[PDB]
Design a protein around this ligand. Structure first.
Ligand code: CLA
Ligand code: CLA
Ligand code: CLA
Ligand code: CLA
Ligand code: CLA
Ligand code: CLA
Ligand code: CLA
Ligand code: CLA
Ligand code: CLA
Ligand SMILES: CC1=C(/C=C/C(C)=C/C=C/C(C)=C/C=C/C=C(C)/C=C/C=C(C)/C=C/C2=C(C)CCCC2(C)C)C(C)(C)CCC1
Ligand code: SF4
Lengths: 32, 95, 159, 34, 733, 80, 54, 62, 141
């Protein structure tokens, strides 16, 4: 019986932000 | 448009020739009161710059929308009020 | 029998359908005078339905679960009349019409103005060609073997 | 729903603020001369 | 280069709104960009493929996270047959209170969406049990997507950029891809199954903490290295086994039972384990085929050259095809798309009849949705295969290098191919429509015994050859004296025969005259779509009407009104025309599948068996009959949970209708209308203060065709999806 | 910025030049045909792409060809 | 801004509640903000710092 | 080139009458004419004409 | 020939229309067509409507080259009237355009050089695959 903690949501959001930064870098490399 | 005769083409007057007129433009400099202008130039002049205006608009809109969405009372929004009735069972007894 | 299909005469559902249709027709008949024209027409329809059901039952047709006849086309000797015989008759007729059309086109091709005969048909020549189509398979095989059926130098586009 | 208030912030954001910013930026980008 | 289309000068210098449209529409076609070299093309493609992988993995991670956060995965796991899975929560400010009450399904505390993707069954079958498992999977997939983004950025750097010769190493790439990406991946999946998922279905709990100590078998790896491979199949699961518990659970890990698990009505897990293990072995062996740095193996060019029939019936054979395929990316893309379309159709056909996931085949709506989804995907993929093959003929084909080989000799008898395809299409169309109309007339006149009902005896004979004992053909697996039956009577045939003689599942459903007529309509659709696509591909380089089409590219509007008129003359237009036929064919297929399964699930198969032989039967007993609860989603008396599906139904009808406007009305009308609008704007007070930057123009001819086809396809898909979901969820039976 | 090409199968009947609505084509002295003249396309910057010249050309296949290309305010036929 | 207030207050989701005026005024102010953003981006896209006047 | 009244077969690949027989009308004997032979056909092409000019090396003697 | 100049000649008698010049003429080129008439006649304006041409020189402002050429073609084939037209730029530059060397384009004239002529049949053009990763178009060769 589990329900996902709030700190887990914080970790997921931070990881998503880092992945978005990486995607921005890749898109910039593709454009240039 | 030289205008002397049926001549409407004139390289000297190319704005008349191409019909580049101001139909209703009025150039009288006196419109408002001096103190009105003082007050409005003092207060409304802050938003003259456009990049700062963009940044302020975006930040203010985001903040206002988030604050209203996350602090709206249940008696106004039905989505925040939530369900109030007993749930209905599915066709084959599936919930 | 084949694919678990029962014969129409043995089947129940064929007879049920016949009974239902006759009952509906008689229910319609109940509204008219015995000697009037509508009564005669309805009676004629009833007799035609009876004759049709008797013929279908006696001809040897297989019947499904729903009570309707089914057809077998895999080549079975007991069901040649369902597909193979009408297929041969159609093939004969269609070959006849196609062969006589081709012969008329070939005969018209060498004329003073082929397009005029193409829109306005030369009736005597057409009738002669049409009558000569009885033995079309023999002539078709003859021209196939004689090398006068196909062409070799035809217009094509840039490959 | 561990948070249960996050949608009330994220849905308005992604639905209104994100499209406005992205459309303004794209309109500025395509309407250039460089 | 200066303006928005940085890759195109002609589009950059365009003063109209056409610039934006065409800059969007040609952005991802790298061969047409200015100053494009082969090396840059290959590297850009490689990085874009990395980006696509990252997007896919983020999509999967998002599914996992949203299900773990807002879904009742554990409650569903406790009672799979009585709980509705939850896809994602709803936060719509535009709702009213009745909608909030109506959408509170499951055990949720607010409005939610019921999932019809089947990921609950798939995740439950593979050992996932709690929400922490789903959260860990979501975080791991986030990490994987980040890794692919880093990989793309790195392999675009000047130090790490691969060379053009690296991208053309066909033998080495195929060796690694065949060995690793297939065999080793399936071997690892077998490892997961055996080591984790099979114990889960028997009441065990194996995770990363106890992976190193939990033996998959009581005597692990002893018999495997002792040659006693049969020890791992001694004690399979019992027919009374309860999935997820230890009641009647065996200890075998690689059985070969065949058939279905009685409680879940899905394939055995140990069968799936031996299957993926055998596939892994076969692929790992097949990898060691082509020559590389070690001086052994075959050479694909020499194989292609050697294969050439004497006597010249095939001409020069397969000579010269190696360079043609290696140097053409469109040839490779077409081959890949054709294979992927066939494989997707195979997945769709083989998943509804042999369900692999526990608790599936009882969720009727999920089964229907999965079938329709992957079948539409397959249709689009096939159409794309043919389109990119036509692009190959126009762009990459070199007539001199392909002199008298199979590829050129295909262009050689193209008129014969198109003629015989046209004959097949015409034959099927005439006689099938004739039979349907004849049956309609027979039933209209009240004489249903006069219709032409033809038994599909060939498919019934094949079904009897599989062991179905209903038609009384008694051949092969239906015959107890056959060598095949005797050979297989101990390995797989007990369970397979028990499953195939059961008439409640979808394993080789019984068929009749209606099934015959529908497979024939499907054949008509297939041969006609093939006709259109092949005509477009073969006539792409030129025809009698326009012998120099190859100089005008793949897509162009027309060649003017001269020579009689040349509308819809390019191969792109053949693609455009064939998309309609693809949609129609897939619609026929999905209609047939859905009606047959609705009748099967309601227990009333007689309605299909009787009403499918005439078209009024379809129109009355499928569409009109099953649209009732859909159209009653919201009415003047309130609204149900089907309100969203009714709204989507109307939305689809509307978008489909809107597509007709672009499809029927052409450009000149709209151009003149826009001219009048521009005059109006320039002459309006208080509006002259605002000036456009781009001169407004009407859409292009090809752009109009594309936009019409897009609105059309979106309306088609949304309408049928809404109808399917609503008509299957209102009853769940 | 369309491109108009003339090929050496021209017979110099001058129909394309008469059909052009924007005066893109003109006749030039030549040797190689009985009329001893051939068509030329010097003002291709004014071509709109109507393809009337192609409709007016008598030849198995056209001696004058128009290849549509980059669009310009003159090619788009805009009066505003 | 003065003319915009009426339509948002008399017609709207909260027109029959006890906060109709405030909701309508906030909606009108939001519309004014959106139009200010539109004006800003239009001015950026249309005029440069060197052009005399049009 | 071929004499007047000859029957010739067109060999120009982009011709509408490729692999079709023609009827030679007139041959120009000027030294610099590039397509001097004039051939008339039975059926009209898409543009509606039935006459074309061909080089002597784009025709067959049959 | 020496290209002619422009002057101040009367315009035709026209009552106005909504099909006249727009802002394009102000910020881009516009066209002027000149001709001489022996008598006053009624002709159809290319922009819609009917106008009266004066006796002697005439001058007319039009927005497109196609309008000027259509009006000139009608004048030549219906009234037997010779015409000229020019191109005018906003800064005052005037470009003489239609009878470029004084002879109409359908008449062969000496001193003209071929442009765009290819010395082959249309079927002898190359294949797009041969000119791959090159900027040629297979009809520029
Ligand atoms: C997907 C994103 C999204 C979201 C989150 C909303 C949210 C909302 N819409 Mg909606 N809408 C959307 C998309 C969306 N809409 C789309 C795509 C359409 C076009 C079909 C509409 C058309 C629409 C209409 C026609 C109406 C709404 C209304 C509303 C509001 C009704 C709820 C309420 O209590 O009103 C109470 C609302 C208020 C008291 C207003 C205060 C909010 C202020 C104005 C925020 C400040 C604006 C901000 C500065 C802008 C920043 C931009 C950068 C609610 C805020 C109603 C409304 O305006 O109200 C209304 O009449 N919507
Ligand atoms: C490819 C399909 C095909 C084709 C071309 C034929 C062709 C033919 N069948 Mg046939 N048949 C088929 C499938 C086919 N059959 C199947 C699946 C069955 C069910 C087992 C039959 C059962 C069948 C019977 C029972 C008979 C034929 C017969 C015939 C011949 C008349 C002809 C050569 C007849 C024949 O050859 O008589 C000796 C005949 O009596 N067929
Ligand atoms: C493709 C992946 C995907 C998709 C389609 C959705 C879809 C949705 N999410 Mg979600 N989400 C995802 C991944 C995804 N999620 C992941 C990985 C996380 C962990 C960080 C979250 C965390 C999350 C929260 C916390 C919330 C949502 C919410 C929502 C809903 C409203 C949209 C929103 O506010 O977005 C917000 C999106 C984010 C905060 C991050 C999304 C992650 C990236 C942007 C996905 C990449 C998109 C794509 C690949 C980029 C290319 C586009 C072309 C909507 C159903 C809201 C909700 O429940 O509404 C009811 C909400 O409050 N999401
Ligand atoms: C063993 C080493 C190895 C491995 C693992 C790979 C793996 C890969 N290479 Mg590759 N490559 C290799 C060596 C290797 N390569 C070598 C040596 C070279 C140089 C000679 C290259 C050159 C190369 C190029 C040039 C490119 C790749 C690309 C790719 C990726 C293809 C896209 C993909 O994920 O398909 C995944 C495919 C599968 C998993 C196969 C599945 C089989 C079918 C389709 C489905 C069956 C599964 C089952 C039925 C469904 C279950 C699903 C579930 C929902 C139930 C893939 C990750 C491409 C790429 O994307 O770049 C990043 C690319 O452009 N490679
Ligand atoms: C890639 C897939 C994979 C991986 C990583 C593992 C990993 C593991 N398995 Mg496992 N297993 C797998 C597939 C896999 N298995 C499959 C498909 C089966 C079914 C036949 C089994 C059956 C199985 C049993 C019955 C047992 C394990 C055990 C183990 C553990 C110790 C392995 C061992 O004894 O040393 C490996 C020793 C070797 C001599 C192998 C090295 C040489 C191999 C053959 C190289 C393979 C070829 C290579 C790719 C090149 C370890 C966690 C044992 C354990 O203690 O688990 C807790 C155990 O009892 N597994
Ligand atoms: C692996 C899948 C795959 C890949 C990599 C490509 C890649 C490509 N396709 Mg293709 N295609 C595919 C699947 C694929 N396609 C399928 C399934 C179809 C059928 C629907 C098509 C139908 C198709 C057509 C009809 C055309 C392409 C074109 C193209 C090229 C440019 C695409 C473009 O401009 O995007 C732009 C994208 C959009 C405007 C999005 C609109 C929504 C590019 C090489 C074009 C091309 O090469 O032109 C010569 C072209 O005309 N493709
Ligand atoms: C449901 C309406 C409908 C019907 C009945 C047809 C019927 C036909 N289409 Mg058609 N088509 C339709 C809608 C329809 N089309 C639409 C909406 C499109 C999209 C533009 C097309 C696009 C299309 C193309 C591109 C092609 C056809 C072809 C055909 C013919 C196939 C041969 C055949 O089955 O003969 C049956 C004969 C009859 C039904 C006539 C009854 C009397 C046939 C005449 C193909 C063709 O001509 O093949 C030779 C072909 O190439 N059609
Ligand atoms: C049934 C489908 C359909 C629809 C909806 C339209 C719609 C339209 N057609 Mg049309 N047309 C169609 C089929 C259709 N056509 C077909 C099949 C043909 C071939 C015969 C034509 C031929 C045709 C011609 C020849 C002409 C039109 C014209 C028009 C316009 C009418 C005037 C107007 O602005 O309406 C106003 C109403 C609407 C556009 C629909 C209502 C608005 C909806 C509800 C949405 C609005 C709000 C929306 C949500 C905004 C938010 C968006 C945001 C969320 C992104 C309009 C765009 C005429 C035109 O140009 O108008 C001057 C015209 O001359 N059409
Ligand atoms: C549906 C449209 C609508 C609605 C509901 C209202 C509603 C209202 N207007 Mg209003 N108004 C409208 C359109 C509308 N107006 C338009 C189109 C104009 C022209 C610009 C005006 C100009 C206008 C003025 C000038 C005044 C109002 C005022 C008012 C308020 C008192 C009357 C009332 C709330 C009055 C007000 O709010 O005073 C406090 C007021 O003085 N309106
Ligand atoms: C145009 C073009 C193209 C395209 C093409 C295509 C798209 C095609 C397709 C095709 C296809 C799509 C095909 C398919 C096929 C299939 C097949 C051929 C199959 C077969 C099968 C079989 C034979 C089976 C058998 C069996 C059985 C029955 C049972 C069990 C056992 C077995 C397995 C034995 C390309 C790119 C090349 C390029 C060039 C041009
Ligand atoms: S396409 Fe039209 S404008 Fe261009 S050369 Fe031919 S006739 Fe003249």
């Amino acid at each position: 019986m589990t329900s996902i903690s709030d700190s887990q949501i914080i970790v997921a959001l931070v990881s998503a932000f880092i992945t978005g930064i990486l995607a921005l870098r890749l898109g910039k490399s593709l454009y240039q | 448009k030289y205008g002397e005769k049926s001549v409407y083409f004139d390289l000297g007057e190319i704005d008349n020739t191409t019909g580049n007129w101001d139909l209703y433009g009025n150039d009288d400099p006196n419109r408002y009161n001096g103190f009105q202008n003082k007050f409005f130039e003092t207060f409304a002049g802050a938003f003259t710059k456009r990049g700062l205006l963009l940044k302020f608009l975006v930040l203010g809109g985001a903040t206002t929308i988030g604050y209203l969405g996350s602090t709206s009372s249940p008696d106004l929004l039905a989505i925040k009020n939530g369900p109030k009735q007993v749930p209905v069972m599915g066709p084959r007894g599936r919930k | 029998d084949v694919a678990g299909l029962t014969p129409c005469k043995e089947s129940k559902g064929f007879a049920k359908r016949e009974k239902q249709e006759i009952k509906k027709l008689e229910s319609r008949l109940k509204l008219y005078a015995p000697d009037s024209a509508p009564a005669l027409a309805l009676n004629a329809t009833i007799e035609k339905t009876k004759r049709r059901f008797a013929f279908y039952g006696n001809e040897g047709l297989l019947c499904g679960t729903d009570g309707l006849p089914h057809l077998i086309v895999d080549g079975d000797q007991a069901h040649l009349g369902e597909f193979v015989y009408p297929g041969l008759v159609f093939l004969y007729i269609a070959g006849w019409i196609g062969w006589v059309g081709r012969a008329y086109l070939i005969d018209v091709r060498t004329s003073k103005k082929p397009t005029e005969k193409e829109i306005i048909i030369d009736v005597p020549l057409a009738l002669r060609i049409m009558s000569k189509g009885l033995t079309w398979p023999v002539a078709a095989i003859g021209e196939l073997r004689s090398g006068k059926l196909v062409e070799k130098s035809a217009n094509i586009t840039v490959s | 729903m561990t948070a249960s208030y996050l949608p009330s912030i994220f849905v308005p954001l992604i639905g209104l603020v994100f499209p406005a910013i992205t459309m303004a930026s794209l309109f500025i980008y395509i309407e250039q001369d460089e | 280069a200066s303006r928005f289309p940085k890759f195109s000068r002609g589009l950059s210098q365009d003063p109209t709104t056409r610039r934006i449209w065409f800059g969007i529409a040609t952005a991802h076609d790298f061969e047409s960009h200015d100053d494009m070299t082969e090396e840059r093309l290959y590297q850009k493609i490689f990085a874009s493929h990395f980006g696509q992988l990252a997007i896919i993995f983020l999509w999967t991670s998002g599914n996992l996270f949203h299900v773990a956060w807002q879904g009742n995965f554990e409650a569903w796991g406790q009672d799979p047959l009585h709980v509705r899975p939850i896809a994602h929560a709803i936060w719509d400010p535009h709702f009213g209170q009745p909608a909030v009450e109506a959408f509170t399904r499951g055990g949720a505390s607010g409005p939610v969406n019921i999932a019809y993707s089947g990921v609950y069954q798939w995740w439950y079958t593979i050992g996932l049990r709690t929400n922490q498992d789903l959260y860990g999977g979501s975080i791991f997939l986030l990490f994987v997507s980040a890794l692919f983004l880093i990989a793309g950025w790195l392999h675009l750097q000047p130090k790490w950029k691969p060379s053009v010769s690296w991208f053309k190493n066909a033998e080495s790439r195929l060796n690694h891809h065949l060995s690793g990406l297939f065999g080793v991946s399936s071997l690892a999946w077998t490892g997961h199954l055996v080591h984790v998922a099979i114990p889960e279905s028997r009441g065990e709990h194996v995770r990363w903490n106890n992976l190193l100590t939990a033996l998959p078998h009581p005597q692990g790896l002893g018999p495997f290295f002792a040659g006693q491979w049969n020890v791992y199949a001694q004690n399979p699961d019992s027919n009374s086994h309860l999935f997820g518990t230890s009641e009647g659970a065996g200890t075998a890990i690689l059985t070969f039972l065949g058939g279905f698990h009685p409680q879940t009505q899905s394939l055995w897990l140990t069968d799936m384990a031996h299957h993926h293990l055998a596939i892994a072995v076969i692929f790992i062996i097949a990898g060691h085929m082509y020559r590389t740095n070690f001086g052994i193996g075959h050479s694909m060019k020499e194989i292609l050259e050697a294969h050439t029939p004497p006597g010249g019936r095939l001409g020069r054979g397969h000579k010269g095809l190696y360079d043609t395929i290696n140097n053409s990316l469109h040839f490779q893309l077409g081959l890949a798309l054709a294979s992927l379309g066939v494989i997707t159709s195979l997945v769709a056909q083989h998943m509804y009849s042999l369900p692999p996931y526990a608790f599936l085949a009882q969720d009727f709506t999920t089964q229907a949705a999965l079938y329709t989804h992957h079948q539409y995907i397959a249709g689009f993929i096939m159409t794309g295969a043919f389109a990119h093959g036509a692009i190959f003929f126009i762009r990459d084909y070199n007539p001199e290098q392909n002199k008298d080989n199979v590829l050129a000799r295909m262009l050689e008898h193209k008129e014969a191919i198109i003629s015989h395809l046209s004959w097949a299409s015409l034959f099927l169309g005439f006689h099938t429509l004739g039979l349907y109309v004849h049956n309609d007339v027979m039933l209209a006149f009240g004489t249903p015994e006069k219709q032409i009902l033809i038994e599909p005896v060939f498919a019934q004979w094949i079904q009897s050859a599989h062991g179905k004992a209903l038609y009384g053909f008694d051949v092969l697996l239906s015959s107890a004296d056959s060598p095949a039956f005797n050979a297989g009577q101990t390995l797989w045939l007990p369970g397979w025969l028990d499953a195939i003689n059961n008439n409640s599942n979808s394993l080789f459903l019984t068929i009749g005259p209606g099934d015959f007529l529908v497979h024939h309509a499907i054949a008509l659709g297939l041969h006609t779509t093939t006709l259109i696509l092949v005509k477009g591909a073969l006539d792409a380089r030129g025809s009698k009407l326009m012998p120099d089409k190859k100089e005008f590219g793949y897509s162009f509007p027309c060649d003017g009104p001269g020579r009689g008129g040349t509308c819809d003359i390019s191969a792109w237009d053949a693609f455009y025309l064939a998309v309609f036929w693809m949609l129609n064919t897939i619609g026929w297929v999905t209609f047939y599948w859905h009606w047959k399964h609705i009748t099967l699930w309601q227990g009333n198969v007689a309605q299909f068996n009787e009403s499918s032989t005439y078209l009024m039967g379809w129109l009355r007993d499928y569409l009109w009959l099953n649209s009732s609860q859909l159209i009653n989603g919201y009415n003047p008396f309130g609204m149900n949970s089907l309100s969203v599906w009714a709204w989507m139904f109307l939305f689809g009808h509307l978008v489909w209708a809107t597509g007709f406007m672009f499809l029927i009305s052409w450009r000149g009308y709209w151009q003149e209308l826009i001219e009048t609008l521009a005059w109006a704007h320039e002459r309006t007070p208080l509006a002259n203060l605002v000036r456009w930057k781009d001169k407004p123009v009407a859409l292009s001819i090809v752009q109009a065709r594309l936009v019409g086809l897009a609105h059309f396809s979106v309306g088609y898909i949304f309408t049928y999806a809404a109808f399917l979901i609503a008509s299957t969820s209102g009853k769940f039976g | 910025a369309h491109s108009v090409k003339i090929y050496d199968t021209c017979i110099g009947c001058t129909q394309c030049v008469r059909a052009c609505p924007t005066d893109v084509l003109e006749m030039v002295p030549w040797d190689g045909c009985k009329a001893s003249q051939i068509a030329s396309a010097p003002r291709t910057e004014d071509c709109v792409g109507c393809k009337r010249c192609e409709s007016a050309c008598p030849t198995d296949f056209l001696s004058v060809r128009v290849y549509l290309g980059a669009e310009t305010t003159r090619s788009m036929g805009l009066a505003y | 801004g003065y003319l915009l207030v009426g339509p948002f207050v008399l017609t709207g989701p909260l027109r029959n509640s006890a906060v109709r005026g405030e909701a309508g005024s906030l909606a009108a102010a939001g519309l004014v903000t959106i139009l200010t953003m539109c004006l800003t981006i239009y001015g950026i896209a249309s005029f440069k710092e060197g052009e005399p006047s049009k | 080139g071929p004499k007047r009244g000859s029957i010739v077969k067109v060999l120009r690949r982009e011709s509408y009458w490729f692999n079709d027989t023609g009827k030679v009308v007139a041959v120009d004997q000027a030294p610099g004419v590039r397509y001097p032979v004039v051939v008339r056909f039975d059926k009209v092409n898409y543009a509606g004409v039935s006459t074309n000019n061909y080089s002597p090396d784009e025709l067959e003697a049959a | 020939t020496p290209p002619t100049l422009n002057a101040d000649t009367p315009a035709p008698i026209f009552g106005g229309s909504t099909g006249g010049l727009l802002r394009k003429a102000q910020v881009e080129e516009f066209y002027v067509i000149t001709w001489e008439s022996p008598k006053e006649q009624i002709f159809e304006m290319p922009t819609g409507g009917a106008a009266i041409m004066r006796s002697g020189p005439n001058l007319l402002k039009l927005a497109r080259k196609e309008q000027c050429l259509a009006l000139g073609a009608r004048l030549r084939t219906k009234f037997k009237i010779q015409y000229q037209f020019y191109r005018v730029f906003p800064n005052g530059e005037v470009q003489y355009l239609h009878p470029k060397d004084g002879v109409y384009p359908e008449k062969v004239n000496a001193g003209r050089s071929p442009v765009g002529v290819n010395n082959r049949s249309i079927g002898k053009n190359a294949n797009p695959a041969e000119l791959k990763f090159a900027h040629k178009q297979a009809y520029d060769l």
